[PDB]
Amino acid sequence: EIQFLRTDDEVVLQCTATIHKEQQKLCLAAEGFGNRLCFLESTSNSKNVPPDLSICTFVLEQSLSVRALQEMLANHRTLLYGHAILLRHSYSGMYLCCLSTSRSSTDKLAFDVGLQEDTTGEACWWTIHPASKQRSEGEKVRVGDDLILVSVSSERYLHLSYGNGSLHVDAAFQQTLWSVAPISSGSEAAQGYLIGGDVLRLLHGHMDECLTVPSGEHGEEQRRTVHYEGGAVSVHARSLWRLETLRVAWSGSHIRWGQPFRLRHVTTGKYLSLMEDKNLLLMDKEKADVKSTAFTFRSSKEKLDVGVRKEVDGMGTSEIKYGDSVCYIQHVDTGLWLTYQSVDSIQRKAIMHHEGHMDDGISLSRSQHEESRTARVIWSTVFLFNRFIRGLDA
Amino acid sequence: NANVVVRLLIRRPECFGPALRGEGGNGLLAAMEEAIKIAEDPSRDGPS
């Protein structure tokens, strides 16, 4: 009846903030390449600013007892309170750990918290202690529960540095309760069916034109535009898109018809949106509101709606099939359907029309893990090298 | 009996005195200099 968090389950570690009279909700994030340090991603402003949960998703690899872990150091199971957990970052593949090297920022004894490639040593492991009086050591782990994590290596609670001007996750003896929310379950997933957070190509027609931005001419303003294009773009990185659900918890559930979501161009890092001029334009993360960036999949071109669904906590029905299913995109608020302009490689523009053409079906193709990783690396590297170039120019 | 005491002391950092609390504590060296200055000062050394 009640679920229990188990190993091989992808989870996001969430914390709450009460800064300046206001209740803010935050999640732990860390980029794989580049900075190994961990920052906090805002989730309460999901309506105004989309969260980036790809770097916030973690996988619970092993849960071992303290004595068994000590013996191992000397050398698919449910979580139980009082055990040692091995957190693996989903995107990077590295492991959360205490760095033992600190910024020396306002805390005498602080150890910074980051990601580590090697699994050897006790720095990567963390002990889960239930905080609530109702929870006792040895109880089943609740889906909605608050946990205090103690480092195996340093015996330092993972806490949020409230005093610092910028909120930082740090390992110290001061304790902060953390809430874990399931993001997806790998085992229950069905192959060939769309899930939340999956990188994919939008394919149109038998010519297999892919919805993509212009090529690498280095002009951001015209890169912001979108159009249908065919050829080698289907195996190029610009055609990569990622689907983020509007919900945070259970964001890996099977996408269903009529479910609002967001589309993000992986290479550019920007989100698809509709402007008042009824034109598609990629917009920035900061200004990417829920209203403008909302898009949904509907089974049939017919305008009559099936109402609304009730959101369920779990994988759900495998209602969207890769390749076989044919989908039509509709903006949630305006209700318009984006269609090819058709006015004439092909370079046919994408426009917003509530009638549209007859052949507006869009097939779905799943991208590979290596390609998704490469696109994310490309975005994260071009950002840093643009910052470097701007600094040198200044 | 030593490990438990150390663990409890680090669990409650207020036991270390204001210099070693870690919340902007000057440090042991500065604290003892301040205490010396208090020692020369009659007003703060005695109730007066």
Side-chain angles (χ1 to χ4, degrees), chain A residues 1-217 219-394, chain B:
Chain A
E1 191 273 330
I2 189 66
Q3 288 323 301
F4 293 134
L5 289 133
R6 317 195 46 194
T7 63
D8 292 330
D9 283 17
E10 203 165 82
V11 71
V12 291
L13 291 75
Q14 281 188 16
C15 62
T16 184
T18 61
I19 309 282
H20 63 87
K21 278 74 69 177
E22 193 273 333
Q23 184 62 255
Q24 206 199 338
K25 197 71 180 98
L26 295 171
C27 187
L28 190 149
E31 269 296 349
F33 287 167
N35 186 32
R36 279 88 168 94
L37 273 297
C38 304
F39 45 91
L40 289 83
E41 184 66 27
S42 178
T43 81
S44 57
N45 215 17
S46 297
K47 302 286 99 175
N48 305 348
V49 172
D52 204 356
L53 301 175
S54 60
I55 60 172
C56 308
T57 42
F58 285 80
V59 177
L60 298 174
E61 184 178 1
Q62 294 87 18
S63 164
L64 274 298
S65 179
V66 292
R67 296 219 155 259
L69 163 76
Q70 188 44 261
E71 298 194 17
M72 295 298 102
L73 294 174
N75 302 140
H76 187 275
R77 319 152 173 207
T78 187
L79 283 299
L80 188 59
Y81 291 129
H83 284 83
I85 192 68
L86 201 58
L87 277 151
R88 188 184 89 257
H89 187 210
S90 56
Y91 165 64
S92 89
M94 299 177 1
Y95 306 90
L96 188 65
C97 69
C98 287
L99 295 176
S100 77
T101 61
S102 195
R103 294 187 297 273
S104 179
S105 46
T106 316
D107 196 76
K108 272 57 166 193
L109 299 169
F111 284 167
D112 270 8
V113 173
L115 282 168
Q116 189 174 3
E117 198 63 81
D118 53 280
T119 188
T120 59
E122 85 180 2
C124 295
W125 294 90
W126 288 80
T127 56
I128 44 173
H129 295 267
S132 166
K133 66 179 290 295
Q134 292 87 23
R135 306 285 79 78
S136 66
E137 282 270 313
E139 267 201 31
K140 300 287 98 175
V141 169
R142 305 276 101 74
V143 180
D145 206 64
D146 293 331
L147 292 176
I148 55 172
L149 279 73
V150 172
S151 64
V152 180
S153 71
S154 66
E155 277 59 15
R156 277 165 167 91
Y157 283 96
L158 182 61
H159 72 89
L160 180 53
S161 50
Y162 285 140
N164 303 167
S166 45
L167 296 175
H168 308 138
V169 288
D170 177 81
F173 310 126
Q174 310 95 62
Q175 60 87 28
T176 301
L177 71 169
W178 287 76
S179 75
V180 290
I183 210 68
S184 179
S185 180
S187 50
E188 307 164 358
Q191 286 71 241
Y193 294 101
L194 170 65
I195 63 170
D198 191 0
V199 180
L200 53 87
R201 280 80 176 273
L202 309 171
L203 316 185
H204 184 273
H206 281 76
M207 73 291 291
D208 300 320
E209 64 183 1
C210 53
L211 193 59
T212 186
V213 302
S215 86
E217 82 284 328
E220 193 272 330
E221 45 274 41
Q222 69 274 18
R223 289 291 300 268
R224 282 192 158 229
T225 61
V226 63
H227 60 83
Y228 297 88
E229 185 178 2
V233 189
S234 50
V235 285
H236 288 351
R238 286 171 311 133
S239 60
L240 277 189
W241 296 83
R242 206 172 80 106
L243 191 147
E244 311 68 42
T245 68
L246 280 187
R247 57 204 304 263
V248 174
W250 269 107
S251 184
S253 65
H254 280 115
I255 310 301
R256 289 163 298 88
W257 293 115
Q259 179 173 5
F261 57 80
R262 281 164 146 155
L263 279 174
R264 170 199 196 122
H265 194 292
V266 187
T267 300
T268 70
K270 298 207 185 317
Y271 293 73
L272 196 46
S273 63
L274 175 64
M275 295 298 102
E276 294 84 4
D277 59 356
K278 304 289 98 175
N279 175 69
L280 276 296
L281 193 66
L282 294 178
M283 65 181 325
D284 193 273
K285 182 179 178 181
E286 303 325 288
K287 296 183 289 295
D289 55 285
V290 62
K291 187 266 183 182
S292 74
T293 48
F295 293 99
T296 186
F297 285 159
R298 263 197 205 77
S299 64
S300 184
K301 178 67 174 149
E302 52 88 21
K303 307 309 170 255
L304 295 176
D305 288 331
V306 286
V308 73
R309 314 255 164 80
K310 152 89 204 91
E311 190 64 33
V312 66
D313 290 331
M315 291 315 300
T317 62
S318 277
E319 194 174 1
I320 301 298
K321 179 67 176 176
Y322 270 119
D324 306 349
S325 66
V326 170
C327 317
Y328 315 89
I329 297 89
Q330 214 187 4
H331 190 276
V332 164
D333 307 66
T334 73
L336 307 180
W337 310 78
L338 92 81
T339 182
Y340 58 93
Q341 184 177 2
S342 68
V343 176
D344 310 306
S345 68
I346 57 172
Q347 290 298 109
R348 289 185 289 114
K349 182 53 197 150
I351 63 171
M352 294 299 291
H353 198 232
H354 62 280
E355 291 83 3
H357 296 104
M358 293 307 90
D359 193 34
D360 291 347
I362 304 287
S363 187
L364 292 195
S365 48
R366 185 153 163 295
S367 178
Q368 270 74 31
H369 190 242
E370 190 275 331
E371 319 168 332
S372 299
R373 282 193 45 63
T374 301
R376 184 67 177 172
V377 171
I378 288 173
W379 171 82
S380 59
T381 288
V382 64
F383 195 36
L384 188 66
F385 285 1
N386 262 334
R387 278 180 51 212
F388 200 44
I389 278 174
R390 275 182 264 117
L392 290 171
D393 278 318
Chain B
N1 288 37
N3 304 329
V4 182
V5 165
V6 185
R7 293 182 184 271
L8 299 173
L9 290 176
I10 60 167
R11 203 47 41 83
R12 295 207 183 94
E14 55 264 53
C15 296
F16 290 135
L20 298 179
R21 294 178 190 269
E23 297 294 328
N26 56 5
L28 191 74
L29 177 49
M32 309 268 298
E33 297 179 353
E34 190 37 69
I36 296 291
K37 292 184 286 291
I38 296 168
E40 290 93 9
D41 184 56
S43 60
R44 300 169 47 156
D45 211 21
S48 63

